[PDB]
Design a protein around this ligand. Sequence first.
Ligand code: NI
Length: 179
Amino acid sequence: MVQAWYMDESTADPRKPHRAQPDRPVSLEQLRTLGVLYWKLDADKYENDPELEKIRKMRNYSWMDIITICKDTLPNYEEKIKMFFEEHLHLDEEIRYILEGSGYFDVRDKEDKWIRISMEKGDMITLPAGIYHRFTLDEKNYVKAMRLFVGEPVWTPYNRPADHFDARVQYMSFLEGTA
Ligand code: NI
């Protein structure tokens, strides 16, 4: 079962778990109220998995590639890592399917409090266009992920504040409608 939680008040060491004390876990159901959706898959089968295919056809994820984040192999690693963890939004979905390793996606809740989502091998997530979010490796310092997109990808982050965008306005309108 995928783990999410509200974060403590420490700003040091972003790769540590930062669990609030006492524990305040967050369910998949609460995540859905933020428009964040999740699927569990057999990541060993990612090259040929009818269950992944079902998701891609349903959601129109017509594009994909594979990315590996580790110090030793990713081009421009240090700057990419910094950019990932700056709070930002996109004008499209951010869909990531974890094939090896792990990481944290943090998202803002309806009161703009951080929720940390621990993503591991087999976990697939979509963060809706307009949601403020960030990503960091955890202390294992390694992740291999499939990136998916609705059509040809545009990866551009808009670092908060990015409130003027239509995608942000529509997302805010979506949040009024959920529990
Ligand atoms: Ni992003």
